[PDB]
Structure 1
């Protein structure tokens, strides 16, 4: 529907990626963060909505980041066509999420309000989730 998050293309058509597996990508900025866990990938529209939520329920300002950005398009072509001919026009952008990325992170608040806003996010995304504290990476050198 809406695609605010965008960039210079460099190219407008691309073979997809479809996810298999990974871990990692701990928290580095804030304290509290959301961990995606499971089967899907994403468009930007979704992320925007989640940001609306996470900005409202936190008054007192309260800081947010998005560690990821969609670097990839999502093509989908005219309605009720026969297959065959050249790959279709643009409709979307994509930020793939294996199990282990950390989409949303916050700090400036307590442990609770974070957790609420993150519930109110994970209902508004495909992926199952998990709540995390920044206490440890798996490497510090």
Structure 2
């Protein structure tokens, strides 16, 4: 469960997703990447689920260069409650996206292994993506 250990404000305004990825849209710390075609709000539990998936398919698989960090928190009020009475309480964390953004690079392991590992990684996920590699 990726975390920021320290925060300024426990809470935020929620945010939006328009446009496209500023940077990190291409594999250059690793060899064989995966990138977005969409965007959403994402959990460290999900990304580490993919981690364990790929690293068990590969069993130590190479090296990654993860591109992201779940900086954003989100709240979740208690249950069967009405509106108002102040903002809800912080619940977990969130990792945000823009399309064209790369999430995981890979290196040290064969391209075909990469393809299938990231297949099993991708099928976890709510989004549409594709494989990439370095220029």
CA deviations on 1:51-77 (whole Å, 9 max, x unpaired) are 110111113641122110011101110
Q: Which consecutive segments of 4 or more residues in structure 1 shift more than 3 A?
A: none
Whether 2:116 is the aligned partner of 1:116: answer yes
Counterpart position of 2:11: 13
Structure 1 residues 68, 111: closer, same or farther in 2, change over 3 A? same
The within-5 A match list for 1:80-95 is 80-95=80-95
CA deviations on 1:93-141 (whole Å, 9 max, x unpaired) are 1111110110011111111000001011111111111011111xxxxxx
The within-5 A match list for 1:44-123 is 44-59=44-59, 61-123=61-123
Structure 1 residues 50, 98: closer, same or farther in 2, change over 3 A? same
Unaligned runs of 5+ in 2: none
Report the 3-state secondary structure (helix = DSSP H, G, I; strand = E; otherwise coil) of the residue aligned with 1:65: coil
CA-based RMSD of the aligned residues comes to: 1.3
Distance 2:11 2:39 in 1: 24
Unaligned runs of 5+ in 1: 136-141
Comparing both structures, which one devotes a greater share of its residues to strand? 1
